[PDB]
Design a protein around this ligand. Structure first.
Ligand SMILES: [Au+]
Ligand SMILES: [Au+]
Ligand SMILES: [Au+]
Ligand code: NA
Length: 129
């Protein structure tokens, strides 16, 4: 599923991300944009052999089991395949654990480089929420 901007903002808002650990909805939507281009099916291999999965590009090194990332954790207790659903529940619920980690949204390289300290509110303007 490739979500529209306001469509993802609404779905993220429902699943409890709006100002979750202090990050406004616009951060999460900006994060999704630059991580996955709003595509629930997005996969990208990292240089270390791990893979990032789904709309928020959750990494196999720590958070999910994909059965080809040796010596890695599954801190969200899920198959990485669950993160590629058109239903974002699992991605959202695993992102909540990630962002609570104590590094906050800095764990998303695209958020830090492209969203952090920008006008993230632009990512929800004109959306009904
Ligand atoms: Au959720
Ligand atoms: Au994020
Ligand atoms: Au959803
Ligand atoms: Na893993």
């Amino acid at each position: 599923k490739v979500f529209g901007r306001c469509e993802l903002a609404a779905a993220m808002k429902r699943h409890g991300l709006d100002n979750y650990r202090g990050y406004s909805l616009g951060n999460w939507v900006c994060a999704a944009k630059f991580e996955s281009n709003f595509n629930t099916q997005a996969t990208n291999r990292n240089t270390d052999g791990s893979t990032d999965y789904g709309i928020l590009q959750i990494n196999s090194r720590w958070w999910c089991n994909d059965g080809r990332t040796p010596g890695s954790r599954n801190l969200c207790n899920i198959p990485c395949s669950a993160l590629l659903s058109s239903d974002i529940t699992a991605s959202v619920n695993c992102a909540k654990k990630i962002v609570s980690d104590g590094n906050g949204m800095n764990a998303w390289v695209a958020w830090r480089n492209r969203c952090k300290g920008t006008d993230v509110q632009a990512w929800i303007r004109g959306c009904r929420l």
